[PDB]
Design a protein around this nucleic acid. Structure first.
Lengths: 386, 136, 224, 347, 63
RNA sequence: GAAUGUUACCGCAAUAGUAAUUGAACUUAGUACGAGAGGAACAGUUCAUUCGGAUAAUUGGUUUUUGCGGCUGUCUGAUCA
RNA sequence: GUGAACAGCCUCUAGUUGAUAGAAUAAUGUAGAUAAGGGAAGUCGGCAAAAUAGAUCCGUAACUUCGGGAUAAGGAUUGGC
């Protein structure tokens, strides 16, 4: 039978598998279609979320209530350290497993990728890739020959890179090895691209342009073994009820005798990975880039450094990337970016940018003055300080 | 929900459910307009669908006009007096509730409506903006 | 001229937009639809530049003005008079005028020499308005109603009056307001009069809901 | 401008009503086993029965009455249109057969709650259902008969116009098979395309015009109106007649162009039959093609409504032609202005 | 070009947040923060209690 | 977690299972059609309700960092603490 | 001591520190917290909870056998110096 008539679903699930994040790296299984017309361009990227702010932008969109008015939403500025290519590995297709042997790394390895392999940094004798660095001493019979196979007996190329932590305020002291696929002309302009780009930073005058639809993948925050009550949505029994007042609703299944799949209770509300798409790049910033707070109303030289700090960060010392909208999953961990998969509907890329007033006040307390020099000037010389 | 409104305005999540004693302050001589039915949605478990600023519901008359009782008449909320939901940041409110007089047909009747009237309902319903006075 | 359309399903075009004889100020609503209406009619010194006020679409409840002189409430911002002032010669005043209310359309009418303000407030910034327009504003209520901009909207010729009006009122204000005062139904027997139509010096845009004898008033009293 | 028709939805007669059959079917069908115990599987079919009940119940017997006014509303002309279709016969047979099946639902509900008794032996239930089905059958039989008539006239009212006698109305009628292709069609835009029309040779060509702010429009029924009621043992001629009886300003049509020598001498003593009936009805005579009038029948036909001789109150006549487009606006205008200075001026 | 300054709290900060209490008929003081909203509901007097800058005008700061 | 020399980092994803829905308004369009009273769909742009998976720069709720400030009864003679 | 008082609380004398401890605070429990708008939409049911609450003064209906109702409801007053 039924109560009234079946009723909706508050115990409705959403993730068949799930589980706790046994790795800081998400599960990237989606890759854009390889194009031959467009030059060598990346498909994925790395970075770290900084936080959110309040940016005033003239709504060019023909709203049915606002339109051309001073309105605000919620955007994020993902920070990204100077990514340097230190590994060139190419592949072909994806049958039932990996299928290659042409793995080319580097020689000048810093103290960032040498900590990823070993938990105990002190026990490490700093002697990694010793048998690989000895191949550069000779003519290179096992190096240059490998590149001759990629130019013919290969297809896709996943460049192995990492993130600088020596200038990153994030207390981790370790780089993040990932895989980035690049699509360009033919199959020989893929391996030779990253080959001639050793010990180099991220260039914004080749691939990275203005207003590009990108994606965002981060890591979700968990809360322990949270039960059906808060994890899904269970009711609250009155105080008159005994032995419980917020316990799980009586299931009463049968449907096969093996109790159903969606009668779930306690597990892990969060601590996984998400996937966000359709995001336009507002402004590409750098590490030594000044005058970040370009206000088109007050005209004052200022940055976007948070006057308070969110949680586990710093005071902006790397290349920040301001993108449209926000991103699921908490920060303080590696965030794998991604370019456009294909000709998406978007239905919002028609509107460009119109950013003016940029917020840079307090993030820990209440929003007051944007610049600390303004408060000092309004106060003047008194007892303490100047 | 389509009886002469300028598009579908942003349905703000207010706090006017079923059984809300609404007052009265306009050209009419009524004191309060008790509502016996508040809706404005569809498929939704458990919930009493509330009415945002600019919705057309049916209310009754208790105190004020004893001659017009136990009947159905339109009642569009002209006074929100509560924090709405926009994109600007601003969230100002009034004090007293709404309460207007309308003929049991599908339109309005009141004209000289005193008291502060929200600009949200004025933009949505042309009849409200045409029959008001003090806006915000 | 005297056209009639269904702009956004609203017969009350006087509420949304406001095409006074001072300056053709059109709100946001009016893309290629309104442009095709007054294409060969306008396009002169008075364009149809879109604008807004205080985050609203209503431009008929902010000011009045005769032929030269438009004010602006202090409630809104100055993000509209910093680019639109280039088109207009010298009419809209850029002086910060303090506003006591917000809506100035159903309390004050616009013409040239005839004006009326419903008694409700004192005399502070209201005197400054009459000083610019140069009109001896005399406060007088009509049938105990606060509204006046939606019941009557006279011009330099005639003036349509709300049907629900006493006979005595349609005689004592015929010499002072220099209008014949013609009472009759309007817009299929609606409750609005000046809120459904805006009389201009040249054209006269109304509504299609207006019946033939209700529309024949313009081509008889106002005379073209 | 309407009355109380063209609002009733479609009604299934008997062939399109096979629903009862379907239901009885599933009913006699049943055969359940009832869960729980195999010894107490006798308790369920009662619910079964209540069900069938409610079903036929709602059925019909209320939607038929909707869409139809009353046998004694206001004017008999509103029911005169049905007289030329179903006739007071099927008429009363209208509300008649109405109340017919109507109470039918009575007997229905009756026997219904009736059996209602017991909630044991699903089988007995099958027999009960069969009986109910039979009962239903013996009804819609003769039912659908006149009910067929029903559906018929039903759709029927889609081509037949319906004016309003509670306002101004200018009666305009003409005589087809003469030359109305470039005369009467100069007023309206009516033309036969898909919708057919019997009775006369042509169809329904009702003219209309919107001068100043008035509203003058009325249909015409040629044939029955052009002959006495006694001559027509029914049909619509009488249709033409009631048609007349309606009006505010009857406009008679003549033709002195002599298409094939069809002058009028016998229908002269016929206008007096409807003369005292025109207490507050204005008359108007319009003659088409006035230029080829030969002096052979002019000195005899003029003693009708043209000159002050017989059965003439003393009105104004018009002699012109709208076929050659000679002051067609003046003719149309000077045919309803008299009504403005009569009923409108007084009331 | 004008500088936004709070009235009841006398503190130039963000224009919105903006939950404010009108005076029905006449106008009201535009709040500059959310903390100023709860400081008006309890009918607190900013003239006596130090929370504004107008009180500092009668004090005098010349060091 | 036991793991066939071991640990860490970086890939391919079989099988089973499966997940977003609906409505209105504006423009085309007071349109095609029609004797009158009347009255649509396709494309493009702009939204809302409900369910599931998330996020905390702003707002609201919560206040064990039992803070800061103020106050009642009693006490270390009394005051500050 | 405060207070209407012999309650409760605080302090002094006398009488005391045996009832497993430590680390940790994810969900599900007994008693005890606090939530804008709406003010009886949950439930068989005024069942839980919360608010109103003392003294002085003022005011205090109908009914009854004038020993009652009556400390009515709705207000005002209240500490220290």
């Amino acid at each position: 039978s039924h109560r009234k008539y079946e009723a909706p679903r508050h115990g409705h699930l959403g993730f068949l598998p799930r589980k706790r994040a046994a790795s800081i790296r998400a599960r990237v299984k989606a890759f854009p279609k390889d194009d031959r017309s467009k030059p060598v361009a990346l498909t994925s990227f790395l970075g770290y979320k900084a936080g959110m702010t309040t940016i005033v932008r003239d709504l060019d969109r023909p709203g049915s209530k606002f339109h051309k008015r001073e309105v605000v939403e919620a955007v994020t500025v993902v920070d990204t350290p100077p990514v340097v290519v230190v590994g060139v590995v190419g592949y072909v297709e994806t049958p039932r497993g990996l299928r290659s042997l042409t793995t080319v790394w580097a020689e000048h390895l810093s103290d960032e990728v040498k900590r990823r392999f070993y938990k105990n940094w002190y026990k490490s004798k700093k002697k990694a890739f010793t048998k690989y660095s000895a191949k550069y001493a000779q003519d290179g019979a096992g190096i240059e020959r490998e590149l001759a196979r990629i130019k013919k007996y290969a297809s896709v190329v996943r460049v192995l890179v990492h993130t600088q932590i020596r200038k990153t305020p994030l207390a981790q002291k370790k780089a993040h090895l990932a895989e980035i696929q690049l699509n360009g002309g033919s199959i020989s302009e893929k391996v030779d691209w990253a080959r001639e780009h050793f010990e180099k930073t991220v260039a914004v005058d080749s691939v990275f342009e203005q207003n590009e639809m990108i994606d965002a993948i981060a890591v979700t925050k968990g809360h322990g073994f949270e039960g059906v009550t808060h994890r899904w949505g269970t009711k609250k029994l009155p105080r008159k009820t005994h032995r419980g007042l917020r316990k799980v609703a009586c299931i009463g299944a049968w449907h096969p005798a093996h109790v159903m799949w969606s009668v779930a209770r306690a597990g892990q509300r969060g601590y996984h990975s998400r996937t966000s798409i359709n995001h336009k790049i507002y402004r590409v910033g750098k590490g030594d880039d000044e005058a970040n707070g370009a206000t088109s109303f007050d005209r004052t030289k200022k940055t976007i450094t948070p006057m308070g700090g969110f949680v586990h960060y710093g005071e902006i010392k790397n290349d920040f990337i301001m993108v449209k909208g926000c991103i699921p999953g908490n920060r303080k961990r590696i965030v794998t970016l991604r370019k456009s998969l294909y000709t998406n509907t978007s239905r919002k890329a028609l509107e460009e940018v119109s950013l003016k007033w940029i917020d840079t006040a307090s993030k820990f307390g209440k929003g007051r003055f944007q610049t600390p020099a303004e408060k000092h000037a309004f106060m003047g010389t008194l007892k303490k300080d100047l | 929900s389509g009886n002469g409104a300028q598009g579908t305005k942003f349905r703000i999540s207010l706090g006017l459910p079923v059984g809300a004693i609404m007052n009265c302050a306009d050209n009419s001589g009524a004191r309060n307009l008790y509502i016996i039915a508040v809706k404005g949605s569809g498929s939704r478990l458990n919930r009493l669908p509330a009415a945002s600023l600019g919705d057309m519901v049916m209310a009754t008359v208790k105190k004020g006009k004893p001659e017009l009782r136990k009947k159905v008449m339109p009642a569009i909320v002209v006074r929100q007096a509560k924090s709405w939901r926009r994109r600007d940041g601003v969230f100002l409110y009034f004090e007293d509730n709404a309460g207007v007089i309308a003929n049991p047909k599908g339109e309005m009747k009141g004209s000289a409506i005193t008291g502060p009237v929200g600009k949200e309902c004025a933009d949505l319903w042309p009849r409200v903006a045409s029959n008001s006075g003090v806006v915000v | 001229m005297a056209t009639r359309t269904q702009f956004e399903n609203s017969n009350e075009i006087g509420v949304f937009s406001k095409l006074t004889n001072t300056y053709c100020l059109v709100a946001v609503g009016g893309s290629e639809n309104f442009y095709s209406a007054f294409e060969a009619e306008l396009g002169d010194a008075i364009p149809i530049v879109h604008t807004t006020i205080a985050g609203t679409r209503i431009i008929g409840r902010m000011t009045a003005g005769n032929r030269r002189g438009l004010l602006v409430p202090t409630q809104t911002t100055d993000q509209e008079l910093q680019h639109l002032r280039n088109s207009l010669p010298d009419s809209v005043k850029i002086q910060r005028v303090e506003e006591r209310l917000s809506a100035l359309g159903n309390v004050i009418c616009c013409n040239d020499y005839v004006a009326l303000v419903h008694p409700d407030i004192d005399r502070e910034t209201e005197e400054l308005i009459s000083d610019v327009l140069g009109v001896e504003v005399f406060r007088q209520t009509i049938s105990g109603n606060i509204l006046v901009g939606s019941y009557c909207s006279l011009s330099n010729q005639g003036g349509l009056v709300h049907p629900q009006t006493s006979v005595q009122d349609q005689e004592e204000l015929s010499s002072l307001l220099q209008v014949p005062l013609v009472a009759g139904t309007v817009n299929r027997g609606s409750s609005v009069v000046g809120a459904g139509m805006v009389v201009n010096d040249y054209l006269a845009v109304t509504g299609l809901d207006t019946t033939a004898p209700e529309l024949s008033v313009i081509e008889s009293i106002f005379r073209l | 401008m309407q009355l109380s028709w063209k609002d009733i939805p479609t009604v299934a007669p008997a062939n399109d009503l096979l629903d009862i059959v379907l239901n009885r079917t599933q009913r006699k069908t049943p055969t359940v086993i009832r869960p729980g115990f195999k010894i107490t599987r006798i308790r369920a079919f009662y619910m079964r029965k209540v069900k069938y009940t409610g079903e036929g119940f709602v059925e019909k017997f209320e939607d038929i009455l909707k869409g139809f006014p009353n046998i004694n509303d206001v004017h008999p002309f509103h029911r005169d249109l049905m007289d030329t279709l179903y006739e007071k016969n099927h008429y009363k047979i209208s509300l008649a057969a109405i109340s017919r099946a109507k109470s039918l639902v009575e007997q229905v509900a009756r026997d219904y709650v009736r059996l209602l008794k017991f909630g044991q032996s699903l089988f007995q239930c099958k027999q009960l259902k069969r009986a109910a089905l039979g009962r239903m059958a013996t009804i819609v039989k003769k039912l659908r008969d006149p009910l067929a008539y029903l559906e018929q006239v039903r759709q029927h009212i889609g081509r037949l116009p319906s004016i309003d006698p509670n306002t101004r109305t200018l009666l305009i009628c003409g005589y087809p098979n003469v030359g109305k292709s470039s005369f009467l069609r100069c007023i309206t835009k009516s033309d036969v395309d898909v919708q057919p029309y019997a009775f006369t040779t042509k169809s329904l060509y009702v003219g209309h015009f919107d001068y100043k702010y008035l509203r003058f429009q009325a249909i015409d029924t040629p044939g029955i109106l052009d002959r006495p009621t006694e001559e027509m043992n029914n049909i619509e001629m009488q249709s033409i007649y009631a048609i007349a009886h309606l009006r505010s300003c009857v406009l008679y049509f003549m033709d002195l162009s002599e298409q094939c020598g069809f002058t009028i001498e016998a229908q002269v003593k016929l206008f007096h039959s409807i003369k005292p009936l025109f207490a507050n009805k204005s008359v108007m005579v319009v003659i088409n093609k006035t230029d080829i009038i030969r002096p052979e029948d002019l000195d005899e036909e003029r003693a009708q409504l043209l000159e002050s001789v017989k059965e003439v109150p003393g009105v104004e006549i018009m002699t012109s032609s709208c076929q050659l487009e000679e002051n067609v606006m003046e003719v149309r205008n000077k045919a309803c202005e008299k009504l403005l200075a009569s009923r409108i001026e007084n009331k | 070009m004008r500088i936004y300054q709070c009235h009841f709290c006398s503190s130039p900060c963000y224009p919105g947040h903006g939950i404010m209490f009108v005076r029905n008929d006449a106008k009201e003081f535009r709040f500059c923060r959310s903390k100023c909203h709860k400081a008006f509901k309890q009918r607190r007097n900013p003239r006596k209690l130090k929370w504004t800058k107008a009180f500092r005008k009668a004090a005098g700061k010349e060091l």
